[PDB]
Amino acid sequence: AKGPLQNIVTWDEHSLFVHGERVVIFSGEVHPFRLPVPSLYLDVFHKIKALGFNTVSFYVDWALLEGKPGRFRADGIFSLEPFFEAATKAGIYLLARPGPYINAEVSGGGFPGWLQRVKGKLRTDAPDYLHATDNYVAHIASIIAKAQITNGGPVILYQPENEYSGAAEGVLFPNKPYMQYVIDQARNAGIIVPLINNDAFPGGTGAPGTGLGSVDIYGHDGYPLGFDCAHPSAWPDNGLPTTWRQDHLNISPSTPFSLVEFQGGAFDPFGGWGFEQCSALVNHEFERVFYKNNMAAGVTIFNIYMTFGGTNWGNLGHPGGYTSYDYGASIREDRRIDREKYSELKLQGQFLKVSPGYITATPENATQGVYSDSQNIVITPLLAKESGDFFVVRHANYSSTDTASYTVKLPTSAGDLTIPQLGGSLTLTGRDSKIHVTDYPVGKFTLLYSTAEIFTWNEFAEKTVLVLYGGAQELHEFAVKNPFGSSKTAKAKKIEGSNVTIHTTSNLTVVLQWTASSARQVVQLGSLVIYMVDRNSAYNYWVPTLPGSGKQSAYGSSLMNPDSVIINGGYLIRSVAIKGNALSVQADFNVTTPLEIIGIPKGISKLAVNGKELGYSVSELGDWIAHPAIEIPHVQVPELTKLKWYKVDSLPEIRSNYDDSRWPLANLRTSNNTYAPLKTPVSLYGSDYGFHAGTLLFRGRFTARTARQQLFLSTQGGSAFASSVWLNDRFIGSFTGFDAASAANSSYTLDRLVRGRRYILTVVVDSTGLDENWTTGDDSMKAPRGILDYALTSSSGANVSISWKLTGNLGGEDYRDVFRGPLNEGGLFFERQGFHLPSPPLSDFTHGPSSSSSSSSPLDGIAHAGIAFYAAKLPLHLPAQEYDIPLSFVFDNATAAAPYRALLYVNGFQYGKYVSNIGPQTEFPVPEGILDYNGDNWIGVALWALESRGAKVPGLALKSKSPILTGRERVEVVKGPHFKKRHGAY
Numbered sequence: 001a002k003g004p005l006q007n008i009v010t011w012d013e014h015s016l017f018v019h020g021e022r023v024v025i026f027s028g029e030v031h032p033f034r035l036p037v038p039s040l041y042l043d044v045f046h047k048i049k050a051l052g053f054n055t056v057s058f059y060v061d062w063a064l065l066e067g068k069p070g071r072f073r074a075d076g077i078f079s080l081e082p083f084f085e086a087a088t089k090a091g092i093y094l095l096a097r098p099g100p101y102i103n104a105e106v107s108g109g110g111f112p113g114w115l116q117r118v119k120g121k122l123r124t125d126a127p128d129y130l131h132a133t134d135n136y137v138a139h140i141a142s143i144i145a146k147a148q149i150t151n152g153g154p155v156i157l158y159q160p161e162n163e164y165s166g167a168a169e170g171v172l173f174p175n176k177p178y179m180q181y182v183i184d185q186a187r188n189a190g191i192i193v194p195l196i197n198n199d200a201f202p203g204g205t206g207a208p209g210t211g212l213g214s215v216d217i218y219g220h221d222g223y224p225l226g227f228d229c230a231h232p233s234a235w236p237d238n239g240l241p242t243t244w245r246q247d248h249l250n251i252s253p254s255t256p257f258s259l260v261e262f263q264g265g266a267f268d269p270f271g272g273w274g275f276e277q278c279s280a281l282v283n284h285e286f287e288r289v290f291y292k293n294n295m296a297a298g299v300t301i302f303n304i305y306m307t308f309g310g311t312n313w314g315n316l317g318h319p320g321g322y323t324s325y326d327y328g329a330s331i332r333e334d335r336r337i338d339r340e341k342y343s344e345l346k347l348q349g350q351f352l353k354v355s356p357g358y359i360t361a362t363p364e365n366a367t368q369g370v371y372s373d374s375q376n377i378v379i380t381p382l383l384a385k386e387s388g389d390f391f392v393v394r395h396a397n398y399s400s401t402d403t404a405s406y407t408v409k410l411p412t413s414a415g416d417l418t419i420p421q422l423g424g425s426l427t428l429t430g431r432d433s434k435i436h437v438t439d440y441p442v443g444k445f446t447l448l449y450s451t452a453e454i455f456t457w458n459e460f461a462e463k464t465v466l467v468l469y470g471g472a473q474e475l476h477e478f479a480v481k482n483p484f485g486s487s488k489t490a491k492a493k494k495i496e497g498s499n500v501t502i503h504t505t506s507n508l509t510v511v512l513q514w515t516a517s518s519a520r521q522v523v524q525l526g527s528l529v530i531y532m533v534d535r536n537s538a539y540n541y542w543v544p545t546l547p548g549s550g551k552q553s554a555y556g557s558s559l560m561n562p563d564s565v566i567i568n569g570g571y572l573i574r575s576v577a578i579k580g581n582a583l584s585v586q587a588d589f590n591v592t593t594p595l596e597i598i599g600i601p602k603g604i605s606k607l608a609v610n611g612k613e614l615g616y617s618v619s620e621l622g623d624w625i626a627h628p629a630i631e632i633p634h635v636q637v638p639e640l641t642k643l644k645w646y647k648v649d650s651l652p653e654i655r656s657n658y659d660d661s662r663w664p665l666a667n668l669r670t671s672n673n674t675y676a677p678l679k680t681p682v683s684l685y686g687s688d689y690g691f692h693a694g695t696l697l698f699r700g701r702f703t704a705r706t707a708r709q710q711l712f713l714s715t716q717g718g719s720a721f722a723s724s725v726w727l728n729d730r731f732i733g734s735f736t737g738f739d740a741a742s743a744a745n746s747s748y749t750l751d752r753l754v755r756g757r758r759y760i761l762t763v764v765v766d767s768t769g770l771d772e773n774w775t776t777g778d779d780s781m782k783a784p785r786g787i788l789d790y791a792l793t794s795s796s797g798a799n800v801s802i803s804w805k806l807t808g809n810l811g812g813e814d815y816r817d818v819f820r821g822p823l824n825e826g827g828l829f830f831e832r833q834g835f836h837l838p839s840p841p842l843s844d845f846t847h848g849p850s851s852s853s854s855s856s857s858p859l860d861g862i863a864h865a866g867i868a869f870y871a872a873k874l875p876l877h878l879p880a881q882e883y884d885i886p887l888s889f890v891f892d893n894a895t896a897a898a899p900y901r902a903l904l905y906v907n908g909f910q911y912g913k914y915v916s917n918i919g920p921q922t923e924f925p926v927p928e929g930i931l932d933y934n935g936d937n938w939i940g941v942a943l944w945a946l947e948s949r950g951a952k953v954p955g956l957a958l959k960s961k962s963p964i965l966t967g968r969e970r971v972e973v974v975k976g977p978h979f980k981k982r983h984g985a986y
């Protein structure tokens, strides 16, 4: 790396520049493959734009796009085109992270399962691995190249590879020829924007200056609390990073300090704590302490992983996680932005985007007892000659939940001042951190200092507006350099509030003190109007940007200090636009509230909200107060237990009339899997035969030699898998699984056999996905699925041979549903047949009354070990044009219930794997777009009873969240193909 290849996106020690403007990049991670509803991407982009972010970072999952080697397919729900179009329409730039390896808690870390057939070490310059990535990178980097800002699109940065940060013992690292080949694939496909990496820690790998394989901007990650959400209140000693400014200067001082992934939640395994408990660990307190600590080090490219997590639908996740990928993120899986951490993150995004002085201030060492007489707080200064200083304050024990009283002594253009200058003390409550400022520009005005935090400011036609906030009951002070100008008359005016005090010095510096509370204080100083609110009130303010013109209209007048309107009230403000003499607002409301609009453009006299005109009151400061009609209706949804359920047996394999003549033979005598050399005479690894997704089945023929024989069977499905065995129709046993078991050794007696007769063992092995490969040189993604080893011995100790057949999804890599992708289906009979698809062939199913002996309902289940599939039509008629109504399917986990596994299908998409004896997921959201809110839907539930007494689903319900009156763009239903009989199925 030797400089920029283009002049649109450039950089220096302090920041990125976009179109010549210095900017703080504040980005949220979103994975387009985890939300297969193209019309919903604009919804998530409006929610992230409203935080004050300007960028989204995204992965691309190779395993979904090249499920058949040599056939790259990114059409329909797999196209990035609607994702790019929504970023341009929202005014968001993108950091593209296509891998090939992405990790991401996805199956294989993004590697397709056919890489288990590649001998060479993954993520090295073994040429079989390198060349296996070429077709994918050539296609995905050319699609990203067309979307670069240099071509009028949203992409501004590209990440090659992922967290290339160490290697197994004895493996070359860093492997600079490998790194360089991955760069060359991107540059050869037309990527000309800067390249950025994401080292796990500040190891220096790939930094500028390291020669072959170096990127343009050195990036690293941070997950300081880890990923285990067992104790969400516990912040352990030494958890806060305190060395990153000096580590940056030691590794890559020529480029901006960049945290390309920083903790926005945590992943959660089977048997984990649930994502509500992750959201309690990475909560609003974590954001204010840890994210302001990154500002203390001068971060200027900062991406929060995850900002919206989505769902691991269609088996796309790895075994170390389950169906949800809510991640505890600021935006929930079902897209709601009610968590307090969302509103706290918005206060920080809105501050940085009006604060260009922060970019060129220089961060210095943290101090204790230097900028305050108190030693109970630590203060990190960011200092500049004239353009303004910033001071990050935290408790000395960063974990402290105590409240401290303090004052500060800060450098200013008027000299060093102990603040408050008018008396009193500041307060830092538990797990809080503040940024205080000196010589902070507010348009034409200047804050000589402020203890209160800045939410936003802007210069409008008739006034300049500044919004300041504090936690409740905190005293704050700020000072404004002479705001009157030449005026002899001019004096402050108190507009609202009865606690604020005003003091003027002889040189006309105005000093204001106030104590934050629910009651806003407002003071006018000439044409400057200051609004002083508490934190909880500031959570409800929004700063939508005014559009510019042309294709890039949504990016506004500039990235920093954009033309804006300030709006107090609402669950979300998505956008504003000027339409003649009207201001038109798009907004969502989850509760009733008024709206106050601050900074009305000149000549505008009409207001609309969500396309409906409304009147307004005018305040003495020229703000509008409007009262939109907000009706939050009671929503009734259908009771699932009352739908007409149909049932089909999904284990016909164990009946004596089953014909397996169409099954693939498991007759490969060698494997290319170098990670797990064969122990058996033939490969029984699914991926060796093209089966990489979901449940596998094996059928083993043998001729009985003695009446009793002993079977040893070693199966592997990934963490929290299970396996079940039958001898002809006789149930032998199950390995019922647990969170810590990815394989199992099982021994069974096969008794009462007729010597000379042929028997068939049917073995079902679930797979919870392919493992990741996060240590280069340890080929962990190659861990196979299926049968690792076996032995069948007679009662005299002779070895008895078994000949095998197997299946996964019908077709393997020639998978049958091109619309829903290569991973959606496993190998269970009902999946193979396509019986999970909309409008299934009801002649092949049975129906009978619930609670009866012939019930076809999953609530009645089955009375033996086995596998059944249940399907029902679910009509919905909900007011989706006006409301966003999140729906989910909830299983009851009754303490007395036999163990089972279940699969949830909605309109042909697999949207849940439920494991009754492992957990933790019971509630499975499914988005509108996959569900049709004004038409028929098909839902499906597979039931796998693991023990001999059978199983049933104890309760299953459709649940709704409180409806949100919405101004989103309309959600279009995803039109997947319906059932058609499959030729060659079995």
Ligand SMILES: *[C@@H]1O[C@H](CO)[C@@H](O[C@@H]2O[C@H](CO)[C@@H](O[C@@H]3O[C@H](CO[C@H]4O[C@H](CO)[C@@H](O)[C@H](O)[C@@H]4O)[C@@H](O)[C@H](O[C@H]4O[C@H](CO)[C@@H](O)[C@H](O)[C@@H]4O[C@H]4O[C@H](CO)[C@@H](O)[C@H](O)[C@@H]4O[C@H]4O[C@H](CO)[C@@H](O)[C@H](O[C@H]5O[C@H](CO)[C@@H](O)[C@H](O)[C@H]5O)[C@@H]4O)[C@@H]3O)[C@H](O)[C@H]2NC(C)=O)[C@H](O)[C@H]1NC(C)=O
Pocket (backbone or CB within 6 Å): 227, 228, 229, 230, 268, 269, 270, 271, 272, 273, 319, 320, 321, 719, 738, 739, 740, 893, 894, 895, 914, 915, 916, 917, 918, 919, 920, 921, 922
């Ligand atoms: C319906 O209700 C029922 C009844 O309530 C629920 O059933 C209950 O389910 C729970 C959870 O599954 C289950 O408890 C677990 O039991 C298993 C099995 O143990 C038993 O069997 C084994 C095998 O014979 C014996 O050897 C044992 O003695 C025991 O008899 C056990 O492994 C679990 O242990 C974990 O949790 C304990 C804390 O609760 C710990 O003390 C353990 O050390 C262990 O801890 C792991 O998991 C914790 C939770 O995630 C985690 O905090 C901790 O750090 C550690 O994580 C590591 O290991 C786990 C694997 O165990 C792994 O998942 C993690 O991996 C992730 O993280 C890595 C590092 O970042 C990452 O690399 C990786 O990719 C990630 O995936 C990590 O390596 C636990 O005791 C109960 O037995 C069961 N009760 C009954 C009566 O059946 C049921 O769940 C409910 N169903 C629904 C749908 O909700």
Ligand SMILES: *[C@@H]1O[C@H](CO)[C@@H](O[C@@H]2O[C@H](CO)[C@@H](O[C@@H]3O[C@H](CO[C@H]4O[C@H](CO)[C@@H](O)[C@H](O[C@H]5O[C@H](CO)[C@@H](O)[C@H](O)[C@@H]5O[C@H]5O[C@H](CO)[C@@H](O)[C@H](O)[C@@H]5O)[C@@H]4O)[C@@H](O)[C@H](O[C@H]4O[C@H](CO)[C@@H](O)[C@H](O)[C@@H]4O)[C@@H]3O)[C@H](O)[C@H]2NC(C)=O)[C@H](O)[C@H]1NC(C)=O
Pocket (backbone or CB within 6 Å): 279, 280, 281, 283, 284, 285, 337, 338, 339, 340, 343, 403, 429, 430, 432, 471, 472, 536, 539, 540, 570, 571, 590, 591, 962
């Ligand atoms: C409609 O959409 C809106 C959003 O637009 C949703 O509103 C959000 O609802 C969520 C869920 O209820 C709210 O989050 C939860 O908030 C509660 C209440 O606490 C908050 O509000 C009170 C004021 O009512 C504040 O006093 C709280 O702040 C104090 O305490 C927190 C510690 O909780 C501390 O960090 C603060 O600094 C502050 O401390 C000061 O006061 C305390 C008390 O006097 C004092 O001891 C201390 O010294 C300081 O002086 C706080 O802002 C909160 O209890 C919950 O937290 C718990 O759960 C989460 C896990 O879920 C954990 O992360 C956390 O650790 C706690 O265990 C939640 O944070 C959210 O605030 C609210 N947002 C807005 C904008 O209103 C609606 O729900 C939606 N409604 C519908 C129908 O859809």
Ligand SMILES: *[C@@H]1O[C@H](CO)[C@@H](O[C@@H]2O[C@H](CO)[C@@H](O)[C@H](O)[C@H]2NC(C)=O)[C@H](O)[C@H]1NC(C)=O
Pocket (backbone or CB within 6 Å): 233, 234, 235, 237, 397, 398, 399, 400, 401, 402
């Ligand atoms: C830093 O402050 C934290 C937060 O108060 C302290 O953590 C507490 O430690 C006590 C005593 O061991 C526990 O009983 C509390 O439950 C902890 N509280 C929380 C919320 O985790 C911590 O010990 C202090 N660290 C140092 C070095 O002083």
Ligand SMILES: OC[C@H]1O[C@@H](SCCc2ccccc2)[C@H](O)[C@@H](O)[C@H]1O
Pocket (backbone or CB within 6 Å): 102, 103, 104, 105, 162, 163, 198, 200, 201, 221, 222, 223, 224, 226, 261, 266, 267
């Ligand atoms: O959700 C976890 C994420 O971890 C990071 S590596 C982070 C390595 C690290 C771990 C702990 C502290 C610091 C860095 C990956 O790049 C993501 O794809 C995703 O898997």
Ligand SMILES: *[C@@H]1O[C@H](CO)[C@@H](O)[C@H](O)[C@H]1NC(C)=O
Pocket (backbone or CB within 6 Å): 117, 118, 119, 668, 670, 671, 672, 688
């Ligand atoms: C092993 O890899 C080679 C590609 O080098 C291929 O020709 C062969 O069929 C593979 N064999 C198996 C058993 O996957």
Ligand SMILES: *[C@@H]1O[C@H](CO)[C@@H](O)[C@H](O)[C@H]1NC(C)=O
Pocket (backbone or CB within 6 Å): 714, 743, 744, 745
């Ligand atoms: C199964 O047993 C074999 C042979 O003893 C051993 O190599 C292997 O580690 C065992 N696997 C498990 C999951 O216990």
